[PDB]
From a paper:
WD repeat-containing protein 5 (WDR5), a core component of the mixed lineage leukemia (MLL) methyltransferase complex, directly binds to kinesin family member 2A (Kif2A) to regulate these mitotic events. WDR5 has two distinct binding pockets: the WDR5-interacting (WIN) site and the WDR5-binding motif (WBM) site. Emerging evidence suggests that the non-canonical role of WDR5 in mitosis is mediated by its interaction with Kif2A, a kinesin-13 family member that specializes in microtubule depolymerization.
To investigate whether this hydrogen bond interaction drives the rotation of Tyr191, we mutated WDR5 Tyr191 to phenylalanine and determined its complex structure with Kif2A. Intriguingly, the WDR5 Y191F variant exhibited a binding affinity of 0.96 μM for the Kif2A 114–122 peptide, demonstrating comparable binding strength to that of the wild-type protein. However, compared with the Tyr191 conformation in Kif2A-bound WDR5, the Phe191 variant rotates approximately 17° toward the conformation observed in apo WDR5, resulting in S7 site closure. These results clearly indicate that the hydrogen bond provided by Ser121 regulates the rotation of Tyr191, acting as a switch to open the S7 site.
Numbering used by the authors:
A (entry chain C): 114 to 121
B (entry chain A): 31 to 334
């Protein structure tokens, strides 16, 4: 994945 | 007066969540980055796939154009940025020095500098020509969600999950201004207005705010969308009516009248969080892109 595509 | 954006193209081909779409300043191209580790280039007016740019070892969270539309910079979970020649597709430089995911990136208008933000809580300023890291700003106390130059490159605005927006002097690296909110919700996005006098800040309480940073006062608030979990790109749309555009976690694109704060249009069709929107520099065109259940980019066109 990528950090932007992962929820906080 | 309300816009009438209508779907024109759906661009498929990314194999994981799309993370960022950006129009080239010259209006010819859309670039998309993805968790699938790829950059794709598409024609802005016909939606035609142009090329795939590859080389990052892990997924990408952001991509940005140089002012002359010849270069791209990307920010990756592999802790690097890469500078790419768009014509050749070749990696010209790998920018090394962050110690965690690189999340966000931008060229300055002169396009001799790149600014980056990272989960390592720093903002870095890089020389485009050499790839040297010129400055490391200890900008925030949590991951940095956005970085953006103002119109002449003299200021950088950063935002963080620490709840702060900060304005930095590019030349010195000194913090000139910190905007705080007592509730301190995570700030998930920030960007200067086109003229550089205002900042648009997203917070993870389903709120966008327009700030006058010369005075440090919030002038407008935009609500109605859903934003609690992702760093969603928002925009000033200026080719026609003066709008604020944002993605949303309810799978819609939201469009507000900047001055009245009323929602003027909601664009339906994505099947996952709209993580990214972009506005074309000269035509009333919006690009939107969505997460893992969708993986597509949509191009929308309005008469105003």
């Amino acid at each position: 994945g990528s950090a932007r595509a992962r929820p906080s | 007066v309300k816009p009438n954006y209508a779907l024109k193209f759906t661009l498929a081909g990314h194999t994981k969540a799309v993370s960022s779409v950006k129009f080239s300043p010259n209006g010819e191209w859309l670039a998309s980055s993805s968790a699938d580790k790829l950059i794709k280039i598409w024609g802005a007016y016909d939606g035609k796939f142009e090329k795939t740019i590859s080389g990052h070892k892990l997924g990408i969270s952001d991509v940005a154009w140089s002012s002359d539309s010849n270069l791209l910079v990307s920010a990756s979970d592999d802790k690097t940025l890469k500078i790419w020649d768009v014509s050749s597709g070749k990696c010209l430089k790998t920018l090394k020095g962050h110690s965690n995911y690189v999340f966000c990136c931008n060229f300055n208008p002169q396009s001799n500098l790149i600014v980056s933000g990272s989960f390592d809580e720093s903002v870095r300023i890089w020389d485009v020509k050499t790839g040297k890291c010129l400055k490391t700003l200890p900008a925030h106390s949590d991951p940095v969600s956005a970085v953006h130059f103002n119109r002449d490159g003299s200021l950088i605005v950063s935002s963080s999950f620490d709840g702060l927006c900060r304005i930095w002097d590019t030349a010195s690296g000194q913090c000139l201004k910190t905007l705080i909110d007592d509730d301190n919700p995570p700030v998930s996005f920030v960007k200067f207005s086109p003229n550089g006098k205002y900042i648009l800040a997203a917070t993870l309480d389903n709120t966008l705010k327009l700030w006058d940073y010369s005075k440090g006062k919030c002038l407008k608030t935009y609500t109605g969308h859903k934003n609690e979990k992702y760093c969603i790109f928002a925009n000033f749309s200026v080719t026609g009516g003066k709008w604020i555009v944002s993605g949303s976690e309810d799978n819609l694109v939201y469009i507000w009248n900047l001055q009245t704060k009323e929602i003027v249009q909601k664009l339906q069709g994505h099947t996952d969080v709209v993580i990214s929107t972009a506005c074309h520099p000269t035509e009333n065109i919006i690009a939107s892109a969505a997460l893992e259940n969708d993986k597509t980019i949509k191009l929308w066109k309005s008469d105003c």
